[PDB]
């Protein structure tokens, strides 16, 4: 089978700035090679065919080179909604193959979160578990400390984050950080808090409620 | 517009099989071999194979030779897939696709099909509204307990996409999935907030409004 190796997996490149995806072929393939686009929400686009030709409505700032084995997809100039996984494909011989993949990270300006806390619904408690969710919208940079405290008692282990792919337009990203407790557990304890700290932020940011004041 | 839509989601239990359709719009069916590629959870694309519909001449890469059989019902202007014998290594998103000549390339792709395998039951999610106690406000809906993946979360029935974040499910220690969705609004007070879960794999359909 022909392996297609793209080595660099992760690539972080600024707005306005031209990127370079490699693919090599374990043997050559005489310019019989594709790109694919993969958005984060799985939905895959033809880019280029045979090796320099655009797919119809595809951006004049993707162009495809190179020639037997060492093949590039270059971005001229760098938007928004190029984050992506790019991915190269042979059709030299059967079975086509793919390139293991080149995830696009985004550089803009940094931008910290705006910070929200829930208390748990009524109608969780009632089943004997609480969820406290900590939500960071909009941030950039990815790295972002989130400590929660009960009652001024930093927390460990009892909390698990998730984070979005970068936003199309703003190239940004959010989190959720959740807080799962015993409904007896919560019962015990009156304030409820996560603490941000984030490069946008010159101090770190608390947001809390009063169990029983809500 | 040329289209192809994929059966939804499928839980599926070690050794046993599952079929899944590509129902093709906006072409001469005929006209066009179909290809078939399998995503594993965070990886790469292999191919699996192709079909010629005109005669039905099959052509698989020799990995997935003793694992899927294509077929195509020519009225129904529909491409099938049979994965036979199945283990936690199919689970994956399997996606099918059109070949065009200018110069083969998948020029139209489907938008895939999550196959989870595992002897672990279907379970429908609880949704919980997510409601405060300074310019924008915030508010969402937990989605908790559900298995397996995925969920769909719309806001007001497709009307609310702005400002809208769901988050990717979390598998938690009791093995089941766990994810909020979550909206902004500069503050709000004029409009309601009705998150609308689906789990086709429990045909649950829940809305949650959120009392503001």
Request: aromatic letters at 10%; charged letters at 15%.
């Amino acid at each position: 089978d022909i392996q297609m190796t793209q080595t660099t997996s992760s690539l972080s490149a600024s707005l306005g700035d031209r990127v370079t995806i490699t693919c090599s072929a374990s043997q050559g393939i005489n310019n019989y090679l594709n790109w694919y686009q993969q958005k984060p929400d799985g939905t895959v686009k033809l880019l280029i065919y045979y090796t320099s030709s655009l797919h119809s409505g595809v951006p004049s700032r993707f162009s495809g080179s190179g020639s037997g084995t060492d093949y590039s997809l270059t971005i001229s100039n760098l938007e928004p909604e190029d984050i992506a996984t790019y991915y190269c494909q042979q059709y030299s011989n059967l079975p086509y193959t793919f390139g293991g993949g080149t995830k696009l990270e985004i550089k803009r300006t940094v931008a910290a979160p705006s910070v929200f806390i829930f208390p748990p619904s009524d109608e969780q408690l009632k089943s004997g578990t609480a969820s406290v969710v900590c939500l960071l919208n909009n941030f950039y940079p990815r790295e972002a400390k989130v400590q929660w405290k009960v009652d001024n008692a930093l927390q460990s282990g009892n909390s698990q984050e998730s984070v979005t792919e970068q936003d199309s337009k703003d190239s940004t990203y959010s989190l959720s950080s959740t807080l799962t407790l015993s409904k007896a557990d919560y019962e015990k304890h009156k304030v409820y808090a996560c603490e941000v700290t984030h490069q946008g932020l010159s101090s770190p940011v608390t947001k809390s409620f009063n169990r029983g004041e809500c | 517009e040329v289209q192809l839509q994929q059966s939804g989601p499928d839980l599926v239990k070690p050794g046993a099989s599952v079929k899944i359709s590509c129902k093709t719009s906006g072409y001469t069916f005929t006209e066009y071999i179909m290809h078939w590629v399998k995503q594993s959870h965070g990886k790469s694309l292999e191919w699996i194979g192709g079909i010629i519909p005109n005669n039905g001449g099959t052509s698989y890469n020799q990995k997935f030779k003793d694992k899927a059989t294509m077929t195509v019902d020519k009225s129904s202007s529909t491409g099938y897939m049979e994965l036979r014998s199945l283990t936690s290594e199919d689970s994956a998103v399997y996606y099918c696709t059109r070949r065009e000549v200018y110069y083969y390339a998948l020029d139209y792709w489907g938008q895939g099909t999550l196959v989870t395998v595992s002897s672990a039951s279907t379970k429908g999610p609880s949704v919980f509204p997510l409601a405060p106690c300074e310019s924008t406000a915030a508010l969402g809906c937990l989605v908790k307990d559900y298995f397996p993946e995925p969920v769909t979360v719309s806001w007001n029935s497709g009307a609310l996409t702005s400002g809208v974040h769901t988050f990717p499910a979390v598998l938690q220690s009791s093995g089941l999935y766990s994810l909020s969705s979550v909206v902004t609004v500069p503050s709000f007070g004029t409009q309601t907030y009705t998150c609308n879960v689906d789990h086709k794999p429990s045909n649950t359909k829940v809305d949650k409004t959120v009392e503001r």
